[PDB]
PDB file of C-alpha atoms in Angstrom:
ATOM      1  CA  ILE Y1923      61.281  58.521 208.257  1.00  0.00           C
ATOM      2  CA  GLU Y1924      58.446  56.308 207.015  1.00  0.00           C
ATOM      3  CA  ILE Y1925      55.566  58.557 208.123  1.00  0.00           C
ATOM      4  CA  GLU Y1926      57.443  61.334 206.201  1.00  0.00           C
ATOM      5  CA  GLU Y1927      56.242  64.301 208.257  1.00  0.00           C
ATOM      6  CA  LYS Y1928      58.387  64.693 211.425  1.00  0.00           C
ATOM      7  CA  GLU Y1929      61.526  63.506 213.388  1.00  0.00           C
ATOM      8  CA  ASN Y1930      64.401  64.635 211.131  1.00  0.00           C
ATOM      9  CA  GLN Y1931      67.535  63.589 213.049  1.00  0.00           C
ATOM     10  CA  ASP Y1932      71.132  64.842 212.562  1.00  0.00           C
ATOM     11  CA  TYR Y1933      74.895  64.483 213.325  1.00  0.00           C
ATOM     12  CA  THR Y1934      78.189  65.520 211.695  1.00  0.00           C
ATOM     13  CA  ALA Y1935      81.699  64.220 210.983  1.00  0.00           C
ATOM     14  CA  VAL Y1936      85.253  65.067 212.036  1.00  0.00           C
ATOM     15  CA  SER Y1937      88.253  66.417 210.062  1.00  0.00           C
ATOM     16  CA  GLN Y1938      91.035  64.515 208.279  1.00  0.00           C
ATOM     17  CA  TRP Y1939      93.635  67.001 209.588  1.00  0.00           C
ATOM     18  CA  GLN Y1940      93.994  65.383 213.031  1.00  0.00           C
ATOM     19  CA  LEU Y1941      95.950  62.238 212.063  1.00  0.00           C
ATOM     20  CA  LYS Y1942      98.945  63.975 210.474  1.00  0.00           C
ATOM     21  CA  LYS Y1943      98.620  66.488 213.329  1.00  0.00           C
ATOM     22  CA  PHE Y1944      99.349  64.334 216.379  1.00  0.00           C
ATOM     23  CA  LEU Y1945      97.838  66.258 219.294  1.00  0.00           C
ATOM     24  CA  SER Y1946      95.173  68.948 219.634  1.00  0.00           C
ATOM     25  CA  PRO Y1947      94.566  70.136 223.237  1.00  0.00           C
ATOM     26  CA  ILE Y1948      91.307  71.966 222.324  1.00  0.00           C
ATOM     27  CA  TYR Y1949      90.023  69.136 220.076  1.00  0.00           C
ATOM     28  CA  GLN Y1950      86.851  68.640 222.195  1.00  0.00           C
ATOM     29  CA  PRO Y1951      85.943  72.331 221.769  1.00  0.00           C
ATOM     30  CA  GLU Y1952      86.370  72.115 217.983  1.00  0.00           C
ATOM     31  CA  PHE Y1953      84.112  69.035 217.910  1.00  0.00           C
ATOM     32  CA  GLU Y1954      81.582  70.877 220.104  1.00  0.00           C
ATOM     33  CA  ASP Y1955      81.698  73.910 217.767  1.00  0.00           C
ATOM     34  CA  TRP Y1956      81.212  71.639 214.728  1.00  0.00           C
ATOM     35  CA  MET Y1957      78.250  69.951 216.431  1.00  0.00           C
ATOM     36  CA  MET Y1958      76.763  73.310 217.501  1.00  0.00           C
ATOM     37  CA  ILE Y1959      77.083  75.063 214.110  1.00  0.00           C
ATOM     38  CA  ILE Y1960      74.977  72.460 212.226  1.00  0.00           C
ATOM     39  CA  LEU Y1961      72.234  72.254 214.882  1.00  0.00           C
ATOM     40  CA  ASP Y1962      71.650  76.012 215.036  1.00  0.00           C
ATOM     41  CA  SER Y1963      71.749  76.137 211.242  1.00  0.00           C
ATOM     42  CA  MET Y1964      69.059  73.431 211.138  1.00  0.00           C
ATOM     43  CA  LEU Y1965      66.907  75.476 213.548  1.00  0.00           C
ATOM     44  CA  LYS Y1966      67.542  78.651 211.517  1.00  0.00           C
ATOM     45  CA  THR Y1967      66.743  76.782 208.260  1.00  0.00           C
ATOM     46  CA  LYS Y1968      63.444  75.568 209.759  1.00  0.00           C
ATOM     47  CA  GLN Y1969      62.707  79.168 210.828  1.00  0.00           C
ATOM     48  CA  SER Y1970      63.581  80.433 207.313  1.00  0.00           C
ATOM     49  CA  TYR Y1971      61.333  77.766 205.754  1.00  0.00           C
ATOM     50  CA  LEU Y1972      58.477  78.753 208.067  1.00  0.00           C
ATOM     51  CA  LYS Y1973      59.018  82.450 207.280  1.00  0.00           C
ATOM     52  CA  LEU Y1974      59.381  81.993 203.497  1.00  0.00           C
ATOM     53  CA  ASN Y1975      55.814  80.705 203.069  1.00  0.00           C
ATOM     54  CA  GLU Y1993      69.243  81.156 197.787  1.00  0.00           C
ATOM     55  CA  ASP Y1994      67.137  83.286 200.122  1.00  0.00           C
ATOM     56  CA  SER Y1995      66.878  80.709 202.917  1.00  0.00           C
ATOM     57  CA  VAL Y1996      70.549  79.701 202.571  1.00  0.00           C
ATOM     58  CA  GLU Y1997      71.825  83.161 203.520  1.00  0.00           C
ATOM     59  CA  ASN Y1998      69.159  83.548 206.225  1.00  0.00           C
ATOM     60  CA  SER Y1999      70.422  80.580 208.253  1.00  0.00           C
ATOM     61  CA  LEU Y2000      74.038  81.717 208.487  1.00  0.00           C
ATOM     62  CA  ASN Y2001      73.120  85.035 210.180  1.00  0.00           C
ATOM     63  CA  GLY Y2002      71.653  83.460 213.320  1.00  0.00           C
ATOM     64  CA  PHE Y2003      74.211  80.630 213.045  1.00  0.00           C
ATOM     65  CA  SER Y2004      77.104  83.139 212.841  1.00  0.00           C
ATOM     66  CA  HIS Y2005      75.765  85.180 215.804  1.00  0.00           C
ATOM     67  CA  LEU Y2006      75.363  82.058 217.996  1.00  0.00           C
ATOM     68  CA  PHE Y2007      78.840  80.917 216.986  1.00  0.00           C
ATOM     69  CA  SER Y2008      80.257  84.464 217.330  1.00  0.00           C
ATOM     70  CA  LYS Y2009      79.595  84.515 221.059  1.00  0.00           C
ATOM     71  CA  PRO Y2010      81.121  81.027 221.644  1.00  0.00           C
ATOM     72  CA  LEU Y2011      84.184  81.730 219.444  1.00  0.00           C
ATOM     73  CA  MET Y2012      85.039  84.820 221.511  1.00  0.00           C
ATOM     74  CA  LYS Y2013      84.511  82.795 224.711  1.00  0.00           C
ATOM     75  CA  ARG Y2014      86.649  79.932 223.287  1.00  0.00           C
ATOM     76  CA  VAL Y2015      89.387  82.396 222.233  1.00  0.00           C
ATOM     77  CA  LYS Y2016      89.443  83.969 225.720  1.00  0.00           C
ATOM     78  CA  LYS Y2017      89.657  80.512 227.344  1.00  0.00           C
ATOM     79  CA  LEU Y2018      92.430  79.488 224.925  1.00  0.00           C
ATOM     80  CA  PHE Y2019      94.376  82.731 225.465  1.00  0.00           C
ATOM     81  CA  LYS Y2020      94.070  82.340 229.259  1.00  0.00           C
ATOM     82  CA  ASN Y2021      96.293  79.237 229.157  1.00  0.00           C
ATOM     83  CA  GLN Y2022      99.900  78.988 227.986  1.00  0.00           C
ATOM     84  CA  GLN Y2023     101.838  76.413 225.975  1.00  0.00           C
ATOM     85  CA  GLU Y2024     105.082  76.790 227.958  1.00  0.00           C
ATOM     86  CA  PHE Y2025     103.528  75.578 231.233  1.00  0.00           C
ATOM     87  CA  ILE Y2026     104.524  72.159 232.558  1.00  0.00           C
ATOM     88  CA  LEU Y2027     101.004  71.437 233.844  1.00  0.00           C
ATOM     89  CA  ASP Y2028      99.420  72.433 230.526  1.00  0.00           C
ATOM     90  CA  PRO Y2029     101.826  70.222 228.522  1.00  0.00           C
ATOM     91  CA  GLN Y2030     101.423  67.443 231.092  1.00  0.00           C
ATOM     92  CA  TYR Y2031      97.639  67.534 230.666  1.00  0.00           C
ATOM     93  CA  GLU Y2032      97.766  67.529 226.853  1.00  0.00           C
ATOM     94  CA  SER Y2043      96.303  75.681 219.772  1.00  0.00           C
ATOM     95  CA  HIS Y2044      95.878  78.279 217.025  1.00  0.00           C
ATOM     96  CA  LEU Y2045      95.544  75.987 214.002  1.00  0.00           C
ATOM     97  CA  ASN Y2046      92.132  74.628 215.084  1.00  0.00           C
ATOM     98  CA  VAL Y2047      90.553  78.090 214.881  1.00  0.00           C
ATOM     99  CA  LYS Y2048      92.105  78.951 211.490  1.00  0.00           C
ATOM    100  CA  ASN Y2049      92.340  75.755 209.399  1.00  0.00           C
ATOM    101  CA  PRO Y2050      88.774  74.226 209.425  1.00  0.00           C
ATOM    102  CA  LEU Y2051      87.296  77.726 209.103  1.00  0.00           C
ATOM    103  CA  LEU Y2052      89.630  78.165 206.090  1.00  0.00           C
ATOM    104  CA  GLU Y2053      87.990  75.133 204.483  1.00  0.00           C
ATOM    105  CA  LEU Y2054      84.471  76.333 205.356  1.00  0.00           C
ATOM    106  CA  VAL Y2055      84.583  80.042 204.337  1.00  0.00           C
ATOM    107  CA  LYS Y2056      84.583  79.030 200.654  1.00  0.00           C
ATOM    108  CA  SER Y2057      81.893  76.386 201.234  1.00  0.00           C
ATOM    109  CA  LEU Y2058      78.880  78.584 200.405  1.00  0.00           C
ATOM    110  CA  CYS Y2059      78.369  81.397 197.886  1.00  0.00           C
ATOM    111  CA  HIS Y2060      76.125  83.282 200.346  1.00  0.00           C
ATOM    112  CA  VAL Y2061      78.428  85.228 202.686  1.00  0.00           C
ATOM    113  CA  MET Y2062      77.772  85.319 206.450  1.00  0.00           C
ATOM    114  CA  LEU Y2063      78.349  88.043 209.045  1.00  0.00           C
ATOM    115  CA  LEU Y2064      81.841  87.321 210.448  1.00  0.00           C
ATOM    116  CA  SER Y2065      83.126  85.400 207.346  1.00  0.00           C
ATOM    117  CA  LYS Y2066      86.392  87.204 206.507  1.00  0.00           C
ATOM    118  CA  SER Y2067      86.692  89.062 209.843  1.00  0.00           C
ATOM    119  CA  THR Y2068      88.389  86.130 211.615  1.00  0.00           C
ATOM    120  CA  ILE Y2069      91.969  87.075 210.738  1.00  0.00           C
ATOM    121  CA  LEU Y2070      92.891  88.533 214.131  1.00  0.00           C
ATOM    122  CA  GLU Y2071      89.568  88.313 215.997  1.00  0.00           C
ATOM    123  CA  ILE Y2072      91.115  86.138 218.725  1.00  0.00           C
ATOM    124  CA  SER Y2100      96.244  61.914 201.029  1.00  0.00           C
ATOM    125  CA  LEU Y2101      96.063  59.637 197.982  1.00  0.00           C
ATOM    126  CA  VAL Y2102      93.651  56.730 197.216  1.00  0.00           C
TER     127      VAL Y2102
END
């Protein structure tokens, strides 16, 4: 930004664990969860910066974890409603996408969040 006051845009990236893993039938929901976690954390970080005047890093993951806690339970209910042995479900296109990227992001920050370690049963060279 050349006026340096407003319009801070954003996006994210996608995992490297979906090329060795050939097919993910809930891949669009994982991409939607990854694009919804960073946007609500940006809004919570702006709210923490407006309320402040370490501390603001832990304050963004509370609202971010609550907003992702409702969609993860909805996503888990929608994933448990379907079955992998169906012919229509295998003809159209499921538990590694909820565990593995969350495994790589629980140790990302020192500041713990609300539902951090409670997601156990809540449902390469150069």
